[PDB]
Amino acid sequence: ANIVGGIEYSINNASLCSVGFSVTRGATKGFVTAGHCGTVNATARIGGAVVGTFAARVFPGNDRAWVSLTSAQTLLPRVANGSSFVTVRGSTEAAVGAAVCRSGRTTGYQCGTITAKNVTANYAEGAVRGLTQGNACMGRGDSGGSWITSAGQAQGVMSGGNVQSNGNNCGIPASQRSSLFERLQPILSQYGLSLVTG
Amino acid sequence: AAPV
């Protein structure tokens, strides 16, 4: 499969999440995603086919993972925006007030601004600390998907937030949305990963 | 808040 931020993958033939970003760990191909999407050794599929397995994860506390891919996969420095792409360039972290977009298999490509940092989410499994908050909308299945600026600076991966009864927070105003992502930088350093860029 |  071609590995693009925002696309669907399944975990052990069960849950669905979204790809964060193509990465390498030395010669090993991978993608970053949310930790809550899978346990270590869980099997990832795209397009019906096995693409790799969860190599490592932290959730709760943090919410991060990377999937270790077979060599047959094609890593791409791209995030889905409809049928277009955003080119991944780097991982410069944007400040509160910056515009940012996110990409995922349920709500697609959604944009807003960064509204707060260092937010705790009190999930049923436990707290996850240190999350960045934006007001782009999101919904169930977008987890793990890319957060990126227009200029291609990868920000992080979708964790969670204030899901409404319809499964998303797109039906409430931006001012009421809490859409939380795990910062990319600590994922890259924790696991020794490099972005694939273009 | 919920994960996703």
Residues making up chain A, counted from first to last? 198
Q: How was this structure determined?
A: X-ray
* B1 to A36: CB separation less than 8 angstroms, yes or no: no
CA A134 to chain CA centroid, Å, is 13
Q: Within a 10 A sphere around the Cβ of A13, how many other Cβ atoms? A: 8
Q: Domains in chain A, please, with CATH?
A: 3-76+184-196 (2.40.10.10), 77-183 (2.40.10.10)
In sequence order, the β-bridge partners of residue A25 are A28
3-state SS, A69-116, equals ECCCCEEEEEEEECCEEEECCECCCCCCCCEEEEEECCCEEEEEEEEE
| Residue A195 near residue A188, CB atoms below 8 Å | yes
Residue A56: name the closest of A45, A41, A69, A70 by CA. Answer: A41
Neighbour tally for A195: CB within 10 Å: 20
Contacts of B3 in chain A (CB under 8 A): 34, 36, 63, 121, 123, 125, 143, 159-160
Cα–Cα distance measured from residue A153 to residue A106, given in angstroms and rounded to the nearest whole number: 22
Q: What is the CA radius of gyration of chain B?
A: 4
Three-class DSSP category at A137: coil
The owner of tokens 């599929």 is: A45
DSSP secondary structure code for residue A42 in this structure: P
Q: How buried is residue A134: exposed, middle or buried, by Cβ count under 10 Å (0-12/13-18/19+)? A: buried
Look up residue A190 and give its DSSP letter. H
> Strand order in A74-81's β-sheet?
A2-5, A74-81, A84-87
Resolution number, Å: 0.9
Q: What is the CA radius of gyration of chain A?
A: 15
Give yes or no for A95 touching B (CB within 8 A): no
- Alpha-carbon distance A117 to A141, whole Å? 23
User: CA geometry: angle at A140 spanning A192 and A144, to 5°?
Assistant: 10
Please list, residue by residue across A79-97, b when 16 or more beta carbons sit within 10 angstroms of its beta carbon and e when fewer do: bbbeeebbebbebebbeee
Instruction: In whole angstroms, give the CA distance from residue A160 to residue A30.
Output: 22
Hey, which residues of A are catalytic here?
A: 36, 63, 143
A161 contacts in chain B (CB < 8 Å): 1-2
Peptide bond into B3 cis (omega under 30): no
